[PDB]
């Protein structure tokens, strides 16, 4: 009955829209819901050379991929969770549903 939703996303405001839609769906379906917990973000850092060869001034890139993760707990059976998570999905957010 304690079902866990993990939301992993690259974009910020799309993930905010998805988690706000999940909050509004849980509030309209009237179940005991916890707050969305923000795991700390991860900045994938890549430092390579701008030049294909090694001839010139020593320049370096900083490729940054910022990934984000949130979690939402639900006190509800599995049919309610599948009914919520089967509606209004977008490619920016990956959803992981854990039963236990």
């Amino acid at each position: 009955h304690r079902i866990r939703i993990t939301l992993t996303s690259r974009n910020v405001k799309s993930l905010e829209k998805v988690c706000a839609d999940l909050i509004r769906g849980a509030k309209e379906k009237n179940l005991k819901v916890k707050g969305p917990v923000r795991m700390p973000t991860k900045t994938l850092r890549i430092t390579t050379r701008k030049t294909p060869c090694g001839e010139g001034s020593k320049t370096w890139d900083r490729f940054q991929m910022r990934i984000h993760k949130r979690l939402i707990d639900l006190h509800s059976p599995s049919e309610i969770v599948k009914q919520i998570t089967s509606i209004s999905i977008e490619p920016g957010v990956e959803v992981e549903v854990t039963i236990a």
Partner: protein
């Protein structure tokens, strides 16, 4: 009766120290140990600055317990030095009259800005092509 819990933080570049004031006796300790044994021991007067500037009567009724994480030695010493003063100012603002709070704040501002205002100086990032934030590697002509 009412719990006079006052939880006030103070921030160095990494060192964040949170002082906790309540009603009690005149004892001040940091991470369980008092101010008498905090290494380096040369900065004992720098920790006893608010006690010597405000007297023992103003600290005789307030117990202070500080949790400490982050920073270095001097960073944590200045963090607890700022946090106990800001916690005393917040306690005297919340639970007693504002006039004595204003006078103690005037004494602290006339002494040093470090007791109340945190420093916004943080470590500048190292750039590519240099060993530090501003320094560059040694250029060789011909």
């Amino acid at each position: 009766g009412p719990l006079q819990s006052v939880q006030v933080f103070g921030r160095k570049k990494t060192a964040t120290a949170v002082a906790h004031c309540k009603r009690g006796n005149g004892l001040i300790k940091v991470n369980g140990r008092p101010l008498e044994m905090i290494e380096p021991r040369t900065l004992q007067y720098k920790l006893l600055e608010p006690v010597l500037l405000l007297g023992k009567e103003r600290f005789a009724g307030v117990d202070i317990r500080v949790r400490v994480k982050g920073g270095g030695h001097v960073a944590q010493i200045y963090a607890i030095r700022q946090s106990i003063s800001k916690a005393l100012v917040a306690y005297y603002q919340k639970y007693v009259d504002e006039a004595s709070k204003k006078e103690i704040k005037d004494i602290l501002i006339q002494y040093d800005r470090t007791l109340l205002v945190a420093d916004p100086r943080r470590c500048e990032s190292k750039k590519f092509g240099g060993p530090g934030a501003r320094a560059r590697y040694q250029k060789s002509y011909r």
